[PDB]
Amino acid sequence: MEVIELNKCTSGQSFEVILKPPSDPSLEEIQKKLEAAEERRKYQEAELLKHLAE
Amino acid sequence: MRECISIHVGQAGVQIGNACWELYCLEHGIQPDGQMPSDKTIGGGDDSFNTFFSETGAGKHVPRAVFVDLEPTVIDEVRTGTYRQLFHPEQLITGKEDAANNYARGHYTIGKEIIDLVLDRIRKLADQCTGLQGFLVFHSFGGGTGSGFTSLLMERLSVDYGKKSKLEFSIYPAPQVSTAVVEPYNSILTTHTTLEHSDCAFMVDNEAIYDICRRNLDIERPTYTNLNRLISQIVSSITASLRFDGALNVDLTEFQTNLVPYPRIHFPLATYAPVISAEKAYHEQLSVAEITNACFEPANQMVKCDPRHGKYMACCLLYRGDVVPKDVNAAIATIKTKRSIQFVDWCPTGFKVGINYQPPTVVPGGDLAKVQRAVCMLSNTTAIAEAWARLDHKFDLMYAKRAFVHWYVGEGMEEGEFSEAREDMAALEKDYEEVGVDS
Amino acid sequence: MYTFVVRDENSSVYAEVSRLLLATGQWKRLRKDNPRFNLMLGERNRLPFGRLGHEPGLVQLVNYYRGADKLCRKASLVKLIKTSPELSESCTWFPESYVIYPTTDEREVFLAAYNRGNVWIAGILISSEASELLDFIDEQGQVHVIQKYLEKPLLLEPGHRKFDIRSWVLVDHLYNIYLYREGVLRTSSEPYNSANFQDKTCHLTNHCIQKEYSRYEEGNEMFFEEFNQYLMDALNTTLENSILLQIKHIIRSCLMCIEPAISTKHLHYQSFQLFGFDFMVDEELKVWLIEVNGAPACAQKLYAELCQGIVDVAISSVFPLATSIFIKLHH
Amino acid sequence: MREIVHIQAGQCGNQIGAKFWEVISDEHGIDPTGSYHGDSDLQLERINVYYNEATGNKYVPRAILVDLEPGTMDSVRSGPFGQIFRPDNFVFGQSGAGNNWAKGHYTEGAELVDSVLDVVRKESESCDCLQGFQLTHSLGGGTGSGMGTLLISKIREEYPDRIMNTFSVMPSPKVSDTVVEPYNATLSVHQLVENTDETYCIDNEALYDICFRTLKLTTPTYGDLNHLVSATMSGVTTCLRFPGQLNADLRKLAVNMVPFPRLHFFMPGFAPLTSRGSQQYRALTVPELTQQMFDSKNMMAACDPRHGRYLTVAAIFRGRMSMKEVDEQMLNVQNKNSSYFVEWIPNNVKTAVCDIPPRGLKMSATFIGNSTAIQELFKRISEQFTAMFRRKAFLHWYTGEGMDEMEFTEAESNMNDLVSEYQQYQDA
Ligand SMILES: CC[C@]1(O)C[C@@H]2CN(CCc3c([nH]c4cc(OC)ccc34)[C@@](C(=O)OC)(c3cc4c(cc3OC)N(C)[C@H]3[C@@](O)(C(=O)OC)[C@H](OC(C)=O)[C@]5(CC)C=CCN6CC[C@]43[C@@H]65)C2)C1
Ligand SMILES: Nc1nc2c(ncn2[C@@H]2O[C@H](COP(=O)(O)OP(=O)(O)OP(=O)(O)O)[C@@H](O)[C@H]2O)c(=O)[nH]1
Numbered sequence A: 001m002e003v004i005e006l007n008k009c010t011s012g013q014s015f016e017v018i019l020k021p022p023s024d025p026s027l028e029e030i031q032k033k034l035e036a037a038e039e040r041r042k043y044q045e046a047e048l049l050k051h052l053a054e
Numbered sequence B: 001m002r003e004c005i006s007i008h009v010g011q012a013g014v015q016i017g018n019a020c021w022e023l024y025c026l027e028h029g030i031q032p033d034g035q036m037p038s039d040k041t042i043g044g045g046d047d048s049f050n051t052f053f054s055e056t057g058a059g060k061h062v063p064r065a066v067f068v069d070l071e072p073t074v075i076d077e078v079r080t081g082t083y084r085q086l087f088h089p090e091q092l093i094t095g096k097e098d099a100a101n102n103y104a105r106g107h108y109t110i111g112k113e114i115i116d117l118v119l120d121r122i123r124k125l126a127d128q129c130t131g132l133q134g135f136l137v138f139h140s141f142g143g144g145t146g147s148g149f150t151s152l153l154m155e156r157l158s159v160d161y162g163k164k165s166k167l168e169f170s171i172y173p174a175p176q177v178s179t180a181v182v183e184p185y186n187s188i189l190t191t192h193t194t195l196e197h198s199d200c201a202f203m204v205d206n207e208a209i210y211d212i213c214r215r216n217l218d219i220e221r222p223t224y225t226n227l228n229r230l231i232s233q234i235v236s237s238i239t240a241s242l243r244f245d246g247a248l249n250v251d252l253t254e255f256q257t258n259l260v261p262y263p264r265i266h267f268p269l270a271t272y273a274p275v276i277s278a279e280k281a282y283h284e285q286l287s288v289a290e291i292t293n294a295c296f297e298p299a300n301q302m303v304k305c306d307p308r309h310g311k312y313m314a315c316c317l318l319y320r321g322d323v324v325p326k327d328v329n330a331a332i333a334t335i336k337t338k339r340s341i342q343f344v345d346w347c348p349t350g351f352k353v354g355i356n357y358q359p360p361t362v363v364p365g366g367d368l369a370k371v372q373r374a375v376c377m378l379s380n381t382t383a384i385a386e387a388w389a390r391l392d393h394k395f396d397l398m399y400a401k402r403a404f405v406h407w408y409v410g411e412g413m414e415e416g417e418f419s420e421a422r423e424d425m426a427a428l429e430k431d432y433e434e435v436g437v438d439s
Numbered sequence C: 001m002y003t004f005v006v007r008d009e010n011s012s013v014y015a016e017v018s019r020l021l022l023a024t025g026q027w028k029r030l031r032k033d034n035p036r037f038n039l040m041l042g043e044r045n046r047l048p049f050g051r052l053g054h055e056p057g058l059v060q061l062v063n064y065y066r067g068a069d070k071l072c073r074k075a076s077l078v079k080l081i082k083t084s085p086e087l088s089e090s091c092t093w094f095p096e097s098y099v100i101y102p103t104t105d106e107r108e109v110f111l112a113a114y115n116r117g118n119v120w121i122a123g124i125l126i127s128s129e130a131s132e133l134l135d136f137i138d139e140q141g142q143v144h145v146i147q148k149y150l151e152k153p154l155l156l157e158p159g160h161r162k163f164d165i166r167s168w169v170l171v172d173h174l175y176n177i178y179l180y181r182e183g184v185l186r187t188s189s190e191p192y193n194s195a196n197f198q199d200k201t202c203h204l205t206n207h208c209i210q211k212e213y214s215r216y217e218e219g220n221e222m223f224f225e226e227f228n229q230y231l232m233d234a235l236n237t238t239l240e241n242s243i244l245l246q247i248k249h250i251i252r253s254c255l256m257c258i259e260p261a262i263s264t265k266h267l268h269y270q271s272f273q274l275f276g277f278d279f280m281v282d283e284e285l286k287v288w289l290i291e292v293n294g295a296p297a298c299a300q301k302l303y304a305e306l307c308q309g310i311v312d313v314a315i316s317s318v319f320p321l322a323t324s325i326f327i328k329l330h331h
Numbered sequence D: 001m002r003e004i005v006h007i008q009a010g011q012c013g014n015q016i017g018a019k020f021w022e023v024i025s026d027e028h029g030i031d032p033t034g035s036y037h038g039d040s041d042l043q044l045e046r047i048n049v050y051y052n053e054a055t056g057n058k059y060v061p062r063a064i065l066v067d068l069e070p071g072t073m074d075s076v077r078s079g080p081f082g083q084i085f086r087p088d089n090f091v092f093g094q095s096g097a098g099n100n101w102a103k104g105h106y107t108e109g110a111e112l113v114d115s116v117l118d119v120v121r122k123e124s125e126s127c128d129c130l131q132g133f134q135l136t137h138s139l140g141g142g143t144g145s146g147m148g149t150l151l152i153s154k155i156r157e158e159y160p161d162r163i164m165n166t167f168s169v170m171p172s173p174k175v176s177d178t179v180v181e182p183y184n185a186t187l188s189v190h191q192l193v194e195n196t197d198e199t200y201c202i203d204n205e206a207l208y209d210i211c212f213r214t215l216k217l218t219t220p221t222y223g224d225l226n227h228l229v230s231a232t233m234s235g236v237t238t239c240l241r242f243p244g245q246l247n248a249d250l251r252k253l254a255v256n257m258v259p260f261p262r263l264h265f266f267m268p269g270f271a272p273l274t275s276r277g278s279q280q281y282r283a284l285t286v287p288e289l290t291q292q293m294f295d296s297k298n299m300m301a302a303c304d305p306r307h308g309r310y311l312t313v314a315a316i317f318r319g320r321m322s323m324k325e326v327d328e329q330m331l332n333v334q335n336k337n338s339s340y341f342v343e344w345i346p347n348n349v350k351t352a353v354c355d356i357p358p359r360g361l362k363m364s365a366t367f368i369g370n371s372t373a374i375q376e377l378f379k380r381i382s383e384q385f386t387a388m389f390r391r392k393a394f395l396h397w398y399t400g401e402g403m404d405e406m407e408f409t410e411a412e413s414n415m416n417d418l419v420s421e422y423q424q425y426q427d428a
């Protein structure tokens, strides 16, 4: 119904047409969480090595 | 003029990036060695294409791109391919051993060992930028790198660049081309961890691309280069406003305001017409009416789903070729009576329209016929949550038996991160349904 | 050889459909959560429509039309008919109806039309003085609907008894609209009563709230042979000319109206659905639409034939194995 | 470079390993001397997964040869590709293990294992990116069985982050008449259930029944058996040896095949089944390959697939053929028998296609199944085991090497555990 904001270029054009109207963590918390599992994992491994040592 | 840095993560992001930069070079007339015969801004300039390429004093135009895979096989192809002289060694980053389709191995294990190197190489580009506005990030949901490194990068990006926009082009997993049974697990994880860090995400379901290739390119068994040449058209369409003179979607912040009133619901649906086999013995060319109408057929979307059952929040039409507005509003006037296009109470039923007179560029020897006019629709419809319910279901069946979970835990990740990711996704499906509630 | 899943276990009609399919020796039935099916007889609620049509190597078909509820929920229908110019106020086969919220609503608009003989309806409740009815919908908390209560119902003799008509309509994937040649009359057992609409059973002709207060016809179910023969003898017409013509026009109009919103012509899965249409016939032999039910049961006599017509029209068309009981309503 | 370290141990382990190097060497264009002859370059693109290169573009199998007795090794050295293995990699003793697990694991084998690890180390020394280890051995003798699993335990302690993979020949009365094999196999399975990532259950009962019933071999030799074994080993390694997308290295394969850590024992299949020499004339159609690939008459483990449910499945097609037809035939397998694939692991069948076919075939298919029906193989060994164990018979052969009945009771319990854990997920 209502074309609006028409703009034209050599390249093309652009506009808007309305048919009807309406009605965060930090570098440290990251390094903490990364190293929290580099540990949980290093422990799961040393536990394996220990069982193998028996 | 404000620069945009492209980041391509994993196999899917790297090969897809290559397809885009190939197209970008054809579209901007930039040879396989970075020489742009029609630039007179020799050694610089603040032109519209300068948002995506910087320039060498020697006349070389070089993508503002960073590719990064935890294994070298793919990116090696890039450092020996037809566009080698284009990129410079310091932007092609490979590890040696990959994520084994394991979100945890890419986020927690092999990620830690490389996040810094990459953030280095990314700020190296941020410093050849006069007013960098943000990042376009290309990655799969299903690989270990594409899901797990990508979500790690995103969080550090929202730390080293708190005021910059981040858009994603995300490949959603489809069994016809997938290589891992655990892709659903990786899809959910990286979405949950990337959600609050992405401003707007364009999801392409390999299922959808794969069928457009069989149905409309009559290709028996689409390959990645088939899929990726088509994905590059759609990506080029979405980014043409950043690379050319115009007044619609002129910077990454505008995609947010145009497509995303609700920040969590930042997954606008792409639809592309027409896709025509370059083998077809001449095609009767399609009108502004016909291609505009083809935007409301599910068989043309990057995600199969039914926008009839769902409400709209924003709609953008992006035209390339022989199009003038009078045709556009006549076409829109018609489809509106023939089709189920319901917006939300708090948004005006309307379309933002962008026309670039240059018709779409085809890759010599690709599968796509050249055409006089083409259009990409960007519509934020709640119907796209059908793809969330599909993925969440597959996740529920496997997780209720902890199937394969031991692979992630094995890498340091806590079983509970699984359930946290899944509850966040359960909130998302809730948001979406709130907005489409009438009928 | 095809596969199907049953996810609505209280469906008389699709119980017989599954039974019929198994007994063909060409339809395996799988566990209700096995994805690799052809046919889904689906739940009546929250059916996972978004999960159909993504099984490579499988043509999938489901027994409901997503969105068809807009025709099958009392207050939805009211809204569908008013706002669809396809139907609208040039509409003459629907009683005046108003959606009302138990305190985008038209409880305001209702009172002004009441001002004129006036009788209206909601276990619900029919009355004639307004001030009290609204108090009822405010008892329960769910938005129901109030329509003109037909003060001049056509009345069967002998018995002087009110009835309604039920037609079963089957919409297939190609949106063919099929009307089952056999319909049924749900016949009030005791006589209609003019002034004083406060006893039910003889006003509300629903099977349940009647098989509980009864003579004339077995099960209070009159079929078309008898009702047509009654029509010839008492009124001197036939069923087709006097009633059916109106019905078929009302079915075709309703389903054509929502077709663009629910068709699966170009969709990654296909749909068919069985609808039950309920009409009342009035004194001047005019036909009115009461409700459409999206999950209808069938009349006991007519199950074998209808449930095998579903198999043949809706299911074997899309999955072919190794006189017609419907009338195709043409559009 | 994603290298793999191959180890073969004992008589069986060394025989079937020799045959595997024979085959994959032909497939890759390497000759009885270690020099490439490829009418193709697909051959050399991933050659370094199983070979190191020398000056003169010489390739040498990254294989280690291990036994407690010098035969076999001599027949391997005086065999087809004998001269092509690195000589300082034959690592052998003299006494042998006499089909006795304890001798291999605890006494004879202890004496020899350190020197095996040194050759491993030196090979591990020089990999850009070590994937892990593949071991060939039988489970019914002493060396491959007892000393093979000791090796596995020592390697995992040195390389806890590499992938452990075995080809484990299971024992069968139809093929062998040594009476203590159920003992040696229950002791090995116990080890394998704890210390490997993937194990191919190459069952001598299947190999026998296939050769006798199907190939119509009335007097099967171990060559007939090992003809089936190298075919299958050639098949299941296809995706590691040529370029590709699916299961292209061990860890990706394990992430695809192993949903629970203990349930990592796989049923290989192969199609078409062939006798050696017996030349081929009409290739299979793609639908033929598929039906045979899943046919129980083609499995290398004597288990009934229709008695269980597939947890996961990898399928590998070789030779020039249409991926569309392959795609269609695999979907149809799944959608016509969906009951047999667990519903709670969506899309659990992954398919690869390689253009190079196996010597003397134009079309072939290799199946790798993780089926709960494998519990049948462990039940069979468990029954033979109890029938001797409840009378503690022949046990003195092991107690005399230092072992306690207790170790036997543990191995028995762990394998019965394994069987019931396979039943849990079949009834889920
Ligand atoms: C692939 C590797 C092998 O080559 C496979 C086998 C065994 N082996 C040595 C070769 C051999 C065979 N036979 C021999 C007789 C002989 O003379 C002194 C000397 C050598 C042999 C076999 C053959 O080629 O036989 C025609 C051979 C051998 C055996 C067999 C079938 C078979 O056929 C293919 N049974 C399944 C079992 C047997 O218990 C049974 O259940 O019968 C159905 C069988 O009892 C009966 C009633 O037969 C028998 C026969 C000697 C008796 C004693 C125990 N053991 C154990 C094997 C077995 C055997 C080939 C290794
Ligand atoms: N459209 C398209 N999708 C791809 C392509 N490459 C990979 N994918 C998708 O990515 C999924 C596999 O995960 P990837 O992102 O490739 O994993 P990766 O990038 O190789 O990194 P890792 O696997 O973790 O080592 C597949 O299921 C595909 O759907 C591609 O070239 N084009």
Ligand SMILES: Nc1nc2c(ncn2[C@@H]2O[C@H](COP(=O)(O)OP(=O)(O)O)[C@@H](O)[C@H]2O)c(=O)[nH]1
Residues within 6 Å of the ligand: D009, D010, D011, D012, D013, D015, D016, D097, D098, D099, D138, D139, D140, D141, D142, D143, D144, D145, D146, D169, D170, D171, D172, D175, D176, D181, D204, D207, D222, D223, D225, D226, D229
């Ligand atoms: N398939 C196959 N099985 C074999 C071969 N050699 C031995 N076996 C099996 O291995 C078992 C004997 O193991 P053995 O060789 O004594 O083990 P080792 O002493 O450690 O070398 C027998 O039951 C055979 O079935 C072979 O070449 N091929």
Ligand SMILES: [Ca+2]
Residues within 6 Å of the ligand: B039, B041, B044, B045, B046, B047, B050, B055
């Ligand atoms: Ca410039």
Ligand SMILES: [Mg+2]
Residues within 6 Å of the ligand: B010, B011, B069, B071, B098, B143, B145
């Ligand atoms: Mg990768």
